[PDB]
Enzyme design. Structure first.
Site, mmCIF file in Angstrom:
data_model
loop_
_atom_site.group_PDB
_atom_site.id
_atom_site.type_symbol
_atom_site.label_atom_id
_atom_site.label_comp_id
_atom_site.label_asym_id
_atom_site.label_seq_id
_atom_site.Cartn_x
_atom_site.Cartn_y
_atom_site.Cartn_z
ATOM 1 N N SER A 126 -6.648 -35.898 12.966
ATOM 2 C CA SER A 126 -8.094 -35.681 12.999
ATOM 3 C C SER A 126 -8.824 -36.838 13.675
ATOM 4 C CB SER A 126 -8.644 -35.439 11.596
ATOM 5 O OG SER A 126 -8.272 -34.131 11.144
ATOM 6 N N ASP A 149 -5.412 -28.359 9.168
ATOM 7 C CA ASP A 149 -5.420 -29.797 8.927
ATOM 8 C C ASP A 149 -4.853 -30.616 10.079
ATOM 9 O OD1 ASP A 149 -6.357 -29.567 6.235
ATOM 10 O OD2 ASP A 149 -4.303 -29.104 5.603
ATOM 11 N N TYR A 186 -18.733 -36.405 8.897
ATOM 12 C CA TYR A 186 -17.343 -36.761 9.233
ATOM 13 C C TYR A 186 -17.236 -37.035 10.732
ATOM 14 C CZ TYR A 186 -12.189 -36.299 9.203
ATOM 15 O OH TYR A 186 -10.835 -36.524 9.283
ATOM 16 N N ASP A 192 -11.981 -39.687 3.395
ATOM 17 C CA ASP A 192 -10.836 -40.550 3.658
ATOM 18 C C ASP A 192 -11.179 -41.998 3.994
ATOM 19 O OD1 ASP A 192 -9.301 -38.225 3.266
ATOM 20 O OD2 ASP A 192 -9.246 -37.855 5.422
ATOM 21 N N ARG A 225 -12.033 -42.552 13.567
ATOM 22 C CA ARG A 225 -11.859 -41.697 12.399
ATOM 23 C C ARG A 225 -10.372 -41.516 12.059
ATOM 24 N NH1 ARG A 225 -14.578 -35.958 13.327
ATOM 25 N NH2 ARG A 225 -12.450 -35.545 14.049
ATOM 26 N N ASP A 226 -10.085 -41.286 10.771
ATOM 27 C CA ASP A 226 -8.736 -40.901 10.335
ATOM 28 C C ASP A 226 -7.733 -41.997 10.691
ATOM 29 O OD1 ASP A 226 -7.165 -38.976 8.979
ATOM 30 O OD2 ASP A 226 -6.536 -38.065 10.863
HETATM 31 O O1 LIG Z 1 -6.157 -35.956 1.208
HETATM 32 C C1 LIG Z 1 -6.245 -35.578 2.610
HETATM 33 C C2 LIG Z 1 -6.111 -36.805 3.488
HETATM 34 O O2 LIG Z 1 -4.837 -37.423 3.164
HETATM 35 C C3 LIG Z 1 -4.643 -38.628 3.858
HETATM 36 O O3 LIG Z 1 -3.365 -39.124 3.511
HETATM 37 C C4 LIG Z 1 -3.239 -39.774 2.216
HETATM 38 C C5 LIG Z 1 -2.626 -38.885 1.190
HETATM 39 O O4 LIG Z 1 -3.603 -37.876 0.782
HETATM 40 C C6 LIG Z 1 -2.308 -39.666 -0.068
HETATM 41 O O5 LIG Z 1 -1.639 -38.788 -0.968
HETATM 42 C C7 LIG Z 1 -1.433 -40.860 0.253
HETATM 43 O O6 LIG Z 1 -0.204 -40.338 0.801
HETATM 44 O O7 LIG Z 1 -2.079 -41.687 1.235
HETATM 45 C C8 LIG Z 1 -2.355 -41.068 2.462
HETATM 46 C C9 LIG Z 1 -3.205 -41.801 3.375
HETATM 47 O O8 LIG Z 1 -2.271 -42.888 3.912
HETATM 48 C C10 LIG Z 1 -4.647 -38.317 5.357
HETATM 49 O O9 LIG Z 1 -4.408 -39.589 6.066
HETATM 50 C C11 LIG Z 1 -5.928 -37.691 5.766
HETATM 51 O O10 LIG Z 1 -5.856 -37.245 7.157
HETATM 52 C C12 LIG Z 1 -6.181 -36.431 4.923
HETATM 53 O O11 LIG Z 1 -7.441 -35.910 5.224
HETATM 54 O O1 LIG Z 2 -11.946 -28.029 8.228
HETATM 55 C C1 LIG Z 2 -12.845 -29.110 7.996
HETATM 56 C C2 LIG Z 2 -12.517 -30.315 8.822
HETATM 57 O O2 LIG Z 2 -11.090 -30.592 8.571
HETATM 58 C C3 LIG Z 2 -10.560 -31.809 9.325
HETATM 59 O O3 LIG Z 2 -9.275 -31.931 9.149
HETATM 60 C C4 LIG Z 2 -10.874 -31.551 10.829
HETATM 61 O O4 LIG Z 2 -10.486 -32.701 11.568
HETATM 62 C C5 LIG Z 2 -12.298 -31.209 11.092
HETATM 63 O O5 LIG Z 2 -12.386 -30.862 12.512
HETATM 64 C C6 LIG Z 2 -12.773 -30.093 10.260
HETATM 65 O O6 LIG Z 2 -14.219 -30.029 10.488
HETATM 66 NA NA NA Z 3 -7.055 -34.755 7.259
#
Ligand SMILES: OC[C@H]1O[C@@H](O[C@H]2[C@H](O)[C@@H](O)[C@@H](O)O[C@@H]2CO)[C@H](O)[C@@H](O)[C@@H]1O
Ligand SMILES: OC[C@H]1O[C@@H](O)[C@H](O)[C@@H](O)[C@@H]1O
Ligand code: NA
Length: 358
Positions: free
Chosen positions: A95, A313, A83, A135, A88-89
């Site tokens: 994140s 989170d 990850y 993700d 990212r994210d």
């Molecule tokens: O499942 C954890 C991740 O969710 C991500 O957001 C999603 C969400 O889970 C879905 O239900 C739907 O709402 O779409 C979203 C993404 O636009 C989130 O962006 C990640 O950070 C989380 O790890």
């Molecule tokens: O807890 C597991 C992982 O969760 C993510 O949301 C965090 O950004 C990471 O730093 C973490 O390693």
């Molecule tokens: Na997340």
């Protein structure tokens, strides 16, 4: 299928999580709950390589697992999450990571994989199971209108390909991340998702070490819900088994005999969210079904705990550069620290609300 990666192996318990749990159990005042909290360290979880700084730690885990196997006459298995994609994210803020596409992100990511491969190569007696980049691919199915995700698409695919191709060379069993029922389980998203996963699998050479997909990572859905959670209205695939049963046939049709693992680490308590898209530190969550290969589905190799309960989170602090308003909603536990850091009050509720109980 015939080769379940967990059969015949003992899972190496994460020392990182064990140290967090041991520290956290000491701060729980109720003595009965403290003893139950401590026993969580004996439950197998995935260890996240969320920064290049943690690669040396992976080497120590592998060496320790190797020694433990020789000592006890067992074969040991280490569970890790890759990850650290650049940018990212991409559809959220909490994140954000250390690498960026604009500053040599892909090259840095390739170096990150090479250093992981270099560690794994030294301990061929230890089996490694890896979840690849939670993700990332799900964001390329439903979030291409998000500019950060659209600009990241080619880098994401190149990095994921580099990970799959090179970890296959040292025999790592890999599950790509595939979101969850409320993200890609919508009937209309199944075919686009299947086409992307198949294309990624083809580009990496269809290696048999690419076992399949991981679902519900860091989320809260049930594997098999007794009745649909109200947030699921409109989606016939209201739990993970529905999602997997609908997606798996599409992958098999493309020539991929894919299997799944499903995170249940924070799924013990259902019907706690106001909307399905609420993902951050959901209040009232409890530990769920413990990891097992007795899954009740031909498609599921293992129930697993990928996201380690207690690790946050994302922060509710609106002054942080990683502030995401999802983490300030009424169903999000507050105040909350930065993503990845320990959230003691959240851990304590996960213990108390565990289903089945600890
Ligand atoms: O499942 C954890 C991740 O969710 C991500 O957001 C999603 C969400 O889970 C879905 O239900 C739907 O709402 O779409 C979203 C993404 O636009 C989130 O962006 C990640 O950070 C989380 O790890
Ligand atoms: O807890 C597991 C992982 O969760 C993510 O949301 C965090 O950004 C990471 O730093 C973490 O390693
Ligand atoms: Na997340």
């Amino acid at each position: 299928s015939a080769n379940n990666p967990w059969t015949g192996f003992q899972i190496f318990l994460s020392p990182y999580y064990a140290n967090e749990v041991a520290a956290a159990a000491k701060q729980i005042t109720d003595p009965t709950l403290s003893s139950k909290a401590a026993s969580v360290a004996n439950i197998p979880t995935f260890t996240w390589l969320d920064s290049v700084a943690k690669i040396p730690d992976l080497g120590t885990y592998l060496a320790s697992a190797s020694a433990l196997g020789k000592s006890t006459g067992t074969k040991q298995l280490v569970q890790i999450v890759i990850y650290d994609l650049p940018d990212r994210d991409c559809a959220a803020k909490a994140s954000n990571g250390e690498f960026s596409i604009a500053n040599n992100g892909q090259a840095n990511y390739e170096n990150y994989i090479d250093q992981i491969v270099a560690q794994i190569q030294q301990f061929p007696d230890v089996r490694v199971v890896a979840v690849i980049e939670p993700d990332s691919l799900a964001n390329l199915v439903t979030n291409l209108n998000v500019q950060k995700c659209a600009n990241a698409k080619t880098t994401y695919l190149a990095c994921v390909n580099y990970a799959l191709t090179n970890l296959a060379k040292v025999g790592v069993y890999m599950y790509m991340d595939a979101g969850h029922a409320g993200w890609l389980g919508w009937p209309a998203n199944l075919s686009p998702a299947a086409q992307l996963f198949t294309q990624v699998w083809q580009n990496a050479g269809k290696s048999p070490f690419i076992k399949g997909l991981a679902t519900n990572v860091a989320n809260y859905n049930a594997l098999q819900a007794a009745s649909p959670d109200p947030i699921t209205q409109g989606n016939p695939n209201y739990d993970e088994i529905h999602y997997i049963n609908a997606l798996a046939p599409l992958l098999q049709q493309a020539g991929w005999d894919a299997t799944f693992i499903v995170d249940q680490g924070r799924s013990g308590v259902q019907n706690i969210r106001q909307q399905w898209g609420d993902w951050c530190n959901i209040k009232g969550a409890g530990f769920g079904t413990r990891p097992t290969t007795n899954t009740g589905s031909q498609f599921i190799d293992s129930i697993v705990w990928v996201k380690p309960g207690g690790e946050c989170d994302g922060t509710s602090n609106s002054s942080s550069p990683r502030y995401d308003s999802t983490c300030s909603l009424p169903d999000a536990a507050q105040p909350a620290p930065e993503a990845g850091t320990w959230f003691q009050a959240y851990f304590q509720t996960l213990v108390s609300a565990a289903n089945p109980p600890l």
